[PDB]
Amino acid sequence: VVQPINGDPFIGSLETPVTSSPLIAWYLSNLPGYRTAVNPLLRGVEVGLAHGFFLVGPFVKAGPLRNTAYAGSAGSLAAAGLVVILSMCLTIYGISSFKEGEPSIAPSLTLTGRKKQPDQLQTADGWAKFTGGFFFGGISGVTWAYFLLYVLDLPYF
Amino acid sequence: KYGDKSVYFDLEDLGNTTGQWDVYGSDAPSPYNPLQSKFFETFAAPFTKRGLLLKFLILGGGSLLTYVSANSTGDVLPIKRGPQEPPKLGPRGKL
Amino acid sequence: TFNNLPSIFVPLVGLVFPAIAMASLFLHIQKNK
Amino acid sequence: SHSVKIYDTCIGCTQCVRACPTDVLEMIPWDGCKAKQIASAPRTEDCVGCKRCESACPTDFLSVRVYLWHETTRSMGLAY
Amino acid sequence: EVKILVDRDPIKTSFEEWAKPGHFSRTIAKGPDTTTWIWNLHADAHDFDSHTSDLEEISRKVFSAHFGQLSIIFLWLSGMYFHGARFSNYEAWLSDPTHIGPSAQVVWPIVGQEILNGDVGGGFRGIQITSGFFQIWRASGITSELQLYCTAIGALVFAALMLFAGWFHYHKAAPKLAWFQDVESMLNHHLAGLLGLGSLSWAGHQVHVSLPINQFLNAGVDPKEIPLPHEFILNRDLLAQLYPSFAEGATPFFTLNWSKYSEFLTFRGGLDPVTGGLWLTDIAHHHLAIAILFLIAGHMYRTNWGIGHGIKDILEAHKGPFTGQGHKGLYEILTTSWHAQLSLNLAMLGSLTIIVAHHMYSMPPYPYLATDYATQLSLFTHHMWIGGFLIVGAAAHAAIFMVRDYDPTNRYNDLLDRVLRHRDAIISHLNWVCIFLGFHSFGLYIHNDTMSALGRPQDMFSDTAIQLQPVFAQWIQNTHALAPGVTAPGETASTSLTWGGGELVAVGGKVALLPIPLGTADFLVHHIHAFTIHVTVLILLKGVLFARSSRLIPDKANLGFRFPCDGPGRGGTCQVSAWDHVFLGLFWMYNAISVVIFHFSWKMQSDVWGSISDQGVVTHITGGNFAQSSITINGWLRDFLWAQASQVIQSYGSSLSAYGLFFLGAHFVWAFSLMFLFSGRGYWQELIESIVWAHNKLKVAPATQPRALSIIQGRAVGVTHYLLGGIATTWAFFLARIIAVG
Amino acid sequence: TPPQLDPNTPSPIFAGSTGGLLRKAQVEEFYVITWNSPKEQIFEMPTGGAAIMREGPNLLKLARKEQCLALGTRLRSKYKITYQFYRVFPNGEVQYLHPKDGVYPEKANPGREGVGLNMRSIGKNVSPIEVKFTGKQSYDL
Amino acid sequence: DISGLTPCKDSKQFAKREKQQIKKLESSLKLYAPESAPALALNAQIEKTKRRFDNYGKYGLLCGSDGLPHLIVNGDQRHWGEFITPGILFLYIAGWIGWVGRSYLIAISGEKKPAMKEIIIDVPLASRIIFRGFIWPVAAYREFLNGDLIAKD
Ligand code: CLA
Ligand code: CLA
Ligand code: CLA
Ligand code: CLA
Ligand code: CLA
Ligand SMILES: CC1=C(C/C=C(\C)CCC[C@H](C)CCC[C@H](C)CCCC(C)C)C(=O)c2ccccc2C1=O
Ligand code: SF4
Ligand code: SF4
């Protein structure tokens, strides 16, 4: 049931039932980290939305004043602050890695071996688009979950 | 020939021998609705410029942080309240 | 507003200036002329 | 990368080369010893710095001599 | 078939090899060129796989060495029984086993050390022991120093017997490899005969000796006017008056009417209220049932006849859902590697020692053990340390198997190859879960410290704060508190009282195991324990898997199991060997077991151990401060280390002055170890060469040239002194505290 | 001597391990070793595990030179076969590496020159004050 | 009375320390029968304590405000017995040892493999050499004057 990676038994990995299952290869390929054909901005928006929609949870329900009246009103600001930290993080990552105009450093071909087009996420402008998408989608998700925490009634976490 | 029986050193196809495969990179087309995509492409383009995003995040995060700390009343955080108690004397009178 | 000045500067030196310095020095660390 | 300089006190025992796990060293012909050979060091750029060459050099102090220097990915023993 | 397979006189008994030192190898049987020769002599002293490269001579050597170890253990037992005979207050302890400190050591009055002979009680001035041997002897129904004296002579007889047996099985008539390599017979005998008949004969002792004498002592009887055990055997009216089930005889047994034997083989769960131990009827039934179990288990493997199993036949035919095609070749490596077997056996023996500690604190099997808090603390602490050490030895010997006794050409296994192949996934996920565990346990402690220091106790991780309750362990306690009513109706009370209920078996003014509660602090410290265990497993399994090759040194198996490094290259390879990994796993086993015994001592001193009043309210030693102080490291520093280490500093004067002294000296040796771990051989060799100049200038130059310790030997001396000093500090602390408070 | 001109020869039978070419092959140089095994047999490969090298020519691609030369010494000492490995940069230009003259480096083949060789005892090196404020060190005169 | 210290036979704190230790021993003596063996050992310790304090009284020990015998190691004759008369008795014995183990090392210095006598000590040779260091100071003195004490490299 376990198989060497792509048949090649001298690359540092293995085709297991965890990393090579069709359910996983469908899930881990159709999520915005690996949408190599679409432009990096839309998938970055998806990533930011998914990461800001939930980051408000820990800050609002475990924060320093979660037991007060400004529980969500301050936890959501804290999550927006972490989003403004992490967009800065991605920004400096893209600045240090890809300078201004180089071609993509991504894996060129796929597992089978067909000449797939290089992922534009790993370019300077591409990762910059990803940073902008992450920032916008993260503030979007933080504010949307702030909207939902007081609008929609849940028994909470 | 990389696809031969136990040959993994095709020298002209050095991406298959080095392990340059995209383990999960799908070249499948845009899944989102094109109008939603256009909305995000127009509304997030201002954040695309990196040199103008780093400066913006620095001078916006620092501004919001030095602002929300300043106008934070004595109900959010207690350091801005004060003692709110009679100050007790130290040892040996006060010294 | 002089008891409010610690609230201005302690974040600006402790959170903001460290972010500035860490970002700038990380760029200086990875630069290539 | 590193700097594996050898000295003329070498006796041509060929143990520094038989210990070298990166082929930094190689015996050449020479006329300064009973064995008529000495251990050169062309592939210093492949030197990891393990000093097995000088943990096998049977001289009073040493003939082969590893001076650690600028560390590259070949000299930092990196398979990644 | 399984023959005897021995040979006569393989090695000549003589003192010629006593004379020439280091005879057992090639590079040591020449003489000392340096002083490293001595260290390499003692280091390779029992490295029999290095002396002779055949399993026959190795196996003879380890067999006779096990005989020497058994002679030593019998000699030590003879010593303990004898010191309990002539240098003890065992009679006075039997008369009053609640206010008389168990003492079986007296010091000589020479330099003022006579004050170590304390007022333990019973007209006896001596050292209060903590081995619980008095409790064993009351569980055996001894009641006389003559019996301890004669079993001491018997243990000396057995020590001489084992020494003669080692001499005979090395020098006069030694087995050959066909005798050791057969393991179906070894398992069959060690199951049916050693552990089966051993438990059977102990159950016979208990049924015939321990139960009557302990029932007499519990009823209240001076141990002098108590009938001897042979009177219980011979005089049937006596033992029949104790248990009328004996009046019928073994026709209850042979007609399978065992229901009438339920007067002395009860399943009476829980502890004996009169004495705080377990019910010796329950223990006799236990050893009997265990005897039946191991006796039917020791007839499983095929030895010489047609019936049975082949361990090869089992392992080579064990297909399954997850890599069952493997398991082939394990009979080869385990019957051709003493290091594989030593690793496996040390792992399971140390884990059993830990199980032993955990089951002796909670189900105290000996009478008046739970109320001798020094005995309980010392036993748990001891067996915890022994288990951790034995597991770390399992690591060392797994590594020594991986380096030396591993040949994929001849002795190939599918499972071990599959483990070595994805070993980086193993160590990566284990490193990750170690980081995760370190954070979400110790960082919880740091959060608690910060919040309590910032004046935010509402934000701590506690029961009066953010609660991290052990729901699963609490649920297990709820079940086992209710288990004997529905799931195990044969038990009148639960297996232990740590679960719950209105059960508090006090024997005097002492508790003996009320139900241990599990709060937020217990969650925190149990995750600290899982953490320290996982980091120890990380270090040790990492040394095991990377003993042979890595991305750094792909020829490590050619460098050996126990080598310092491969030089400063590759950045540095300082502690790359598997020996260095067990050397670090020793420090982490120390951290693990030290926090384990700290959890134990504080939890018992706060929630269990204490006094019981005439109104019925328990006053603990520390006072229940584990749920509020053991959430912060400042509380461990304050309410545990600073608070409980008051009796070890006030120890000076009273008998416990030695524990005071052994505190500081232990504190020293630990620090003395830091001279070795931090430093390196080069500085000390250069200092030594300056001192050698100073000696050459006085014609006092030695011929054994002074060399600084080997790098590996510096690390060994360091970890040795470190473990000694830390463990002796904790031993002094524990014993002084618990002998001065309970 | 002319190099041996690495062909597309087969590889050993190996079930795969976590010791292969991660990123030092994608963007930097990786290595490849070729050995002629007279018979098919099992051998402990340096990336952890145990592979079965085939009869005739075999080829194994490794991540660094120490893996190649460790495996080569184990082959030459245990199986007594003649190994020779290369270095292949990610653009090509396979570099012949190990023998460099056809004969192993322990043999004093003529032609190879003296490089990294001081014609002095080791303690006749000048002090660092002599070479201070100069790009040279005390072991390059 | 040097260094502001009263003698110990006159110091009230010294006698108070004696009485305190004696009462501490007697409070442990009450728990045992007066004819029993622990009681007799405690009484022997009591007489040992009493004569210890008496002997520190009579031997000129000086006691401080804490009431403990202090040692005056400066050179005053009254207190030579505290440091110098033992100290010489050390430097003799110590210099015995080093003069023996050195001499032994010179006697096994001229062997073929002299290291197998470091780990396997020639008991006859060592017993011949041991008493050479009885009157070691004159041997060391003369060897210093003859130059045989310091190797000439
Ligand atoms: C590591 C242990 C630990 C833990 C658990 C906590 C927990 C907490 N701390 Mg404490 N703290 C710690 C260590 C820790 N601390 C240490 C070490 C220090 C000092 C060095 C402090 C100092 C400190 C201060 C000074 C304060 C806190 C506060 C807090 C609270 C709010 C944290 C916050 O902003 O939420 C943000 C949390 C997140 C962003 C976490 C997201 C993680 C998600 C849930 C992981 C999900 C993974 C998912 C399962 C992956 C698989 C699925 C995927 C594939 C989809 C929270 C109760 C605050 C407080 O008092 O509130 C009570 C506060 O003011 N902490
Ligand atoms: C007096 C009887 C006698 C005599 C003359 C010999 C003579 C010999 N034996 Mg045998 N042997 C004997 C008894 C004897 N043995 C017994 C009783 C046992 C069972 C343990 C053995 C088991 C045995 C084995 C397994 C081996 C020998 C070997 C040898 C030879 C080497 C001896 C040597 O250098 O070690 C001298 C060593 C010592 C004197 C050390 C004594 C260690 C004892 C047993 C333990 C003491 C531990 C102590 C309590 C703890 C330390 C405390 C301390 C810190 C204060 C030599 C021919 C070896 C041989 O020929 O193989 C090449 C060998 O491998 N012997
Ligand atoms: C049913 C018979 C039987 C019994 C009782 C034992 C018992 C034991 N064996 Mg095993 N063994 C057996 C059969 C048996 N063996 C067979 C058939 C083989 C060949 C396959 C082996 C091969 C074997 C090896 C290779 C080793 C042992 C070891 C041990 C001892 C382990 C230490 C221990 O648990 O201490 C508990 C201690 C005791 C119970 C005290 C023992 C006292 C009695 C007198 C000896 C036990 C009976 C014994 C078999 C001798 C019979 C009489 C003799 C005159 C022939 C233990 C005493 C190990 C050991 O310690 O080495 C010495 C060891 O290395 N045995
Ligand atoms: C069943 C138990 C068992 C057995 C049979 C062995 C057997 C062996 N071990 Mg293993 N080992 C064990 C348990 C065991 N070990 C445990 C529990 C640990 C963890 C600490 C180790 C860790 C370990 C390492 C790390 C190494 C071995 C090695 C060895 C071999 C040679 C040992 C030697 O010659 O030293 C002879 C004996 C000594 C040198 C004496 C040791 C002195 C100890 C450490 C001091 C402690 C004594 C005391 C408690 C302190 C107070 C003393 C007092 C006087 C002040 C031998 C095969 C070595 C090996 O095979 O390498 C090739 C090796 O490197 N072992
Ligand atoms: C107190 C001393 C100390 C500490 C903190 C550590 C910490 C660590 N050791 Mg080390 N180690 C130590 C002593 C220590 N060690 C000693 C004395 C030895 C002697 C042999 C070793 C030997 C050793 C080995 C051999 C191994 C470790 C491992 C580890 C790690 C496991 C836990 C982890 O990562 O969880 C999370 C981190 C911690 C629990 C550390 C404390 C941090 C706390 C929780 C709060 C953090 C606050 C937060 C980050 C804010 C920071 C401030 C901000 C301004 C940036 C961690 C880095 C293992 C490892 O690296 O692999 C996993 C490993 O294999 N250690
Ligand atoms: C202190 C120290 C030393 C020096 C330690 C010495 C050399 C070992 C101690 C040897 C003892 C003192 C030798 C004397 C014992 C003899 C048996 C002589 C007995 C005769 C009388 C002294 C009784 C190292 O060599 C070293 C090496 C690597 C890492 C750390 C260290 C390290 O910390
Ligand atoms: S090891 Fe030393 S002596 Fe021997 S060949 Fe090499 S340089 Fe010469
Ligand atoms: S410091 Fe010591 S252990 Fe580290 S590389 Fe150098 S010699 Fe080896």
Side-chain angles (χ1 to χ4, degrees), chain E residues 382-413:
Chain E
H382 175 95
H383 290 114
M384 265 285 163
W385 281 113
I386 299 294
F389 266 109
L390 292 200
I391 293 158
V392 176
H397 293 298
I400 297 155
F401 161 82
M402 284 304 313
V403 181
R404 302 174 171 177
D405 305 305
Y406 180 74
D407 211 319
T409 312
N410 319 335
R411 286 162 185 90
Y412 168 74
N413 188 14

Side-chain angles (χ1 to χ4, degrees), chain E residues 114 228 406 531 558 708:
Chain E
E114 54 260 28
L228 290 315
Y406 180 74
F531 165 54
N558 293 44

Side-chain angles (χ1 to χ4, degrees), chain A residues 54-55 58-59 62-64 66 82, chain E residues 439-440 443-444 446-447 450-451 454 456 459 461 466:
Chain A
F54 97 98
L55 261 176
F59 288 109
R66 78 279 177 195
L82 201 66
Chain E
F439 278 126
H440 304 80
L444 308 181
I446 295 304
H447 173 98
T450 320
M451 289 298 112
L454 297 165
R456 298 158 65 176
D459 296 352
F461 288 112
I466 293 155

Side-chain angles (χ1 to χ4, degrees), chain E residues 237-351 353-416:
Chain E
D237 55 354
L238 183 57
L239 177 63
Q241 204 263 308
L242 259 282
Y243 303 112
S245 43
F246 274 72
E248 295 91 340
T251 175
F253 176 83
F254 283 103
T255 75
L256 299 160
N257 263 266
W258 301 349
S259 43
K260 69 217 297 194
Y261 269 180
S262 198
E263 308 163 9
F264 74 109
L265 299 176
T266 63
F267 218 129
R268 180 166 292 105
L271 267 53
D272 204 356
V274 61
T275 180
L278 279 169
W279 280 97
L280 273 78
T281 74
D282 218 339
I283 298 161
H285 196 175
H286 170 85
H287 286 104
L288 172 53
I290 277 286
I292 311 314
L293 191 84
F294 292 158
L295 273 159
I296 65 182
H299 299 82
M300 178 205 163
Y301 310 92
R302 183 176 57 233
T303 67
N304 211 347
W305 298 269
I307 56 130
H309 287 277
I311 288 166
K312 189 184 161 193
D313 195 303
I314 291 158
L315 298 159
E316 296 188 338
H318 217 103
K319 303 287 176 282
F322 194 22
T323 182
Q325 78 290 322
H327 282 114
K328 178 172 169 191
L330 266 154
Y331 188 73
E332 271 71 29
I333 73 188
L334 280 153
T335 67
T336 68
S337 187
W338 283 96
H339 286 286
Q341 273 285 352
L342 177 53
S343 83
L344 190 51
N345 299 147
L346 268 174
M348 306 322 290
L349 184 63
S351 285
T353 324
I354 277 147
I355 291 280
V356 152
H358 257 271
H359 288 178
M360 263 159 34
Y361 94 88
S362 82
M363 299 168 290
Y366 306 105
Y368 301 111
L369 188 101
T371 72
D372 206 70
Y373 299 148
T375 302
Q376 279 270 78
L377 186 65
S378 319
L379 289 169
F380 187 88
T381 314
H382 175 95
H383 290 114
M384 265 285 163
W385 281 113
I386 299 294
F389 266 109
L390 292 200
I391 293 158
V392 176
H397 293 298
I400 297 155
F401 161 82
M402 284 304 313
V403 181
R404 302 174 171 177
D405 305 305
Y406 180 74
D407 211 319
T409 312
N410 319 335
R411 286 162 185 90
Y412 168 74
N413 188 14
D414 195 1
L415 303 168
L416 187 54

Side-chain angles (χ1 to χ4, degrees), chain E residues 42-47 339 342 346 389-390 392-393 396-397 400 404 561-562 579 582 586 720:
Chain E
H42 291 96
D44 301 88
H46 303 157
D47 194 16
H339 286 286
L342 177 53
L346 268 174
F389 266 109
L390 292 200
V392 176
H397 293 298
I400 297 155
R404 302 174 171 177
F561 153 76
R562 181 180 82 204
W579 191 94
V582 61
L586 272 169
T720 306

